[PDB]
Amino acid sequence: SMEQVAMELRLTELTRLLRSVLDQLQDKDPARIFAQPVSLKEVPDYLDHIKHPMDFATMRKRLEAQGYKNLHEFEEDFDLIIDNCMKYNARDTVFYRAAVRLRDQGGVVLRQARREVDSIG
């Protein structure tokens, strides 16, 4: 149908906007602490601690499959990255501190993304 196509064009455009959001958020992680999944070879007990692991490469796979239907879903995954880190790692670690900085800096980017998604529909 013509409606299914119109809906698919909306999803594609959302995907385009979320790709730019993802790039901006990942720039706020210059140390690449959150770039890839925590290694189960190197942290073999990780899944005993963290039930829903997340990282930027995993988000990028979902994004490119047009697997985010709305900004809320994308934010859920970003928040997992931060929240998993802040639970697994102690306050006095480079990892925890990197998550706090990513949260604080990403807030700005996500504030305007929400306005852009509401604005452009």
Side-chain angles (χ1 to χ4, degrees), residues 1-2 4-6 8 11-15 17-40 42-60 62-68 70-110 112-119 121:
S1 70
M2 211 22 259
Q4 291 299 324
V5 167
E8 294 160 1
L11 179 65
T12 298
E13 282 306 298
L14 174 68
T15 304
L17 182 159
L18 298 180
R19 191 181 302 113
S20 166
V21 177
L22 184 63
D23 292 345
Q24 282 176 79
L25 294 173
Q26 190 153 27
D27 288 337
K28 307 314 181 152
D29 172 30
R32 297 192 75 82
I33 290 163
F34 306 105
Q36 291 295 329
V38 170
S39 167
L40 306 175
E42 300 165 8
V43 191
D45 73 353
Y46 188 66
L47 301 184
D48 291 349
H49 293 269
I50 297 298
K51 297 296 170 187
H52 298 97
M54 193 44 57
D55 66 274
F56 287 131
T58 302
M59 294 189 60
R60 196 171 293 282
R62 188 169 160 189
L63 179 66
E64 290 314 330
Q66 302 186 345
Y68 293 114
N70 55 54
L71 181 58
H72 177 77
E73 291 186 346
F74 175 100
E75 291 173 303
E76 281 191 330
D77 273 353
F78 180 63
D79 283 342
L80 276 177
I81 293 177
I82 296 314
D83 291 341
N84 288 345
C85 186
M86 290 173 76
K87 290 170 194 64
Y88 189 81
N89 304 105
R91 211 150 41 244
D92 78 325
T93 62
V94 63
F95 307 106
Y96 184 112
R97 290 164 173 286
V100 165
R101 292 163 62 82
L102 180 60
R103 189 195 62 190
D104 285 353
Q105 296 194 278
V108 179
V109 171
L110 292 171
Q112 204 50 45
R114 160 54 61 205
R115 295 191 68 84
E116 285 180 313
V117 165
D118 292 359
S119 185

